[PDB]
């Protein structure tokens, strides 16, 4: 969240230039993505009575829907084409390349490689593995409410790219 | 097809392999050794020293037993073994894929 | 060859050794509607498909289809 908010704020450092459009789109996509990520963390903490990687492992093999949600959340966070996340990244980086190409390269490198790898390491380690500990207390799966919340977040992140381009 | 009713793990018998066959194969392997003199005297309750297996010959026999049975035995388990009975019990109860 | 089969909990919705009795009808009802959907998509997309001229055809430079530069 700190990273995405800082990128959005940087998008507003050129007064009322075209960067505002990318900033607004990135604000929307960050809102939805952060909601998704925090809801996944909430589900993990509520069904597994911990939100620490050392105590949580192999979520997929006991709660396949939750693991799938985690994996698709990681894919969306990676900024795949077809998502408002990718569109906002494209806007911001296209502007920053002409503003200061070396700074744009450093920002892209750091955020989308080092930070992305750090983010993905913990989530992959949690999702994968083998949950041999505390077999009597393992949860069942996501509920309908959680499943539909996740699905709606994904649906918005995907379909908002078709919004009218007049305002973007 | 598995029934829709709940079915629990069925530990039929602790042995994953025919214990009689395991014991006979192990006894044949032991008899193959040069130090071993009388195959008849060998029994599941007979100790390695009394049947004639030296401590150094024991590791050779155990390596060849590993080769024959398609498994690997830890040094801790090999040292813990005290009789052919224990050896055959461990080998038979061992899951070949761990 | 494969690993020995082990029991899977009934309550858990997992794919371990899942075989469906009605797989024939399931495949029938999952294949044809997908084919119809993709036929609709294909016929929609063909409206915006481009192909080069054929073997015996040449593009007239003054024809409307020929590329036209911007007029200031």
């Amino acid at each position: 969240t700190i990273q995405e908010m800082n990128i959005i704020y940087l998008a507003f450092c050129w007064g009322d230039s075209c960067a505002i459009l990318g900033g607004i789109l990135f604000s929307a996509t960050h809102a939805f993505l952060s909601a998704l990520m925090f809801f996944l963390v909430d589900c993990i903490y509520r069904r597994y009575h911990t939100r620490s990687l050392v105590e949580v492992n192999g979520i997929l093999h006991i709660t396949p829907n939750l693991g799938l949600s985690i994996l698709f959340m990681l894919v969306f966070f990676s900024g795949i084409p077809g998502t408002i996340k990718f569109i906002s990244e494209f806007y911001i980086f296209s502007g920053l390349l002409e503003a200061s190409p070396f700074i744009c390269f450093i920002l892209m490198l750091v955020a989308n490689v080092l930070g992305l790898i750090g983010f993905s390491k913990s989530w992959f380690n949690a999702t994968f593995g083998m949950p041999k500990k505390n077999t009597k207390y393992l949860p069942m799966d996501l509920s309908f409410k959680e499943s539909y919340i996740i699905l709606y977040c994904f649906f918005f992140l995907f379909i908002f790219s078709y919004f009218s381009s007049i305002f973007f | 097809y598995a029934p829709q009713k709940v079915v629990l793990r069925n530990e039929k018998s602790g042995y994953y392999a025919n214990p009689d066959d395991v014991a006979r194969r192990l006894i044949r392997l032991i008899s193959l050794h040069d130090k071993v003199q009388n195959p008849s005297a060998i029994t599941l309750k007979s100790t390695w020293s009394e049947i004639g297996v030296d401590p150094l010959s024991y590791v050779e026999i155990m390596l060849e037993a590993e080769n024959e049975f398609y498994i690997e035995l830890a040094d801790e388990d090999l040292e813990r073994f005290r009789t052919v009975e224990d050896a055959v019990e461990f080998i038979a109860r061992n899951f070949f894929t761990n | 060859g494969g690993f020995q089969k082990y029991p899977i909990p009934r309550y858990l919705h997992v794919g371990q050794w899942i075989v469906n009795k009605n797989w024939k009808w399931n495949t029938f009802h999952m294949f044809f509607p997908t084919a119809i959907l993709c036929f609709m998509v294909w016929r929609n997309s063909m409206i915006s498909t481009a192909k080069p001229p054929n073997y015996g055809e040449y593009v007239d430079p003054q024809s409307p289809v020929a590329p036209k530069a911007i007029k200031y």
């Binding site: 050392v54 | 039929k12 042995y15 994953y16 392999a17 | 690993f3 020995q4």
Partner: peptide
């Protein structure tokens, strides 16, 4: 031939922690 018992639960041996997980190795 032999009627093997079900796959043992020892196939996945539970790991017991015996050393502190240093924060410096996060």
């Amino acid at each position: 031939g032999w009627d093997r018992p079900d796959v043992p639960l020892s196939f996945n041996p539970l790991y017991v922690h015996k050393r502190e997980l240093s924060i410096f190795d996060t």
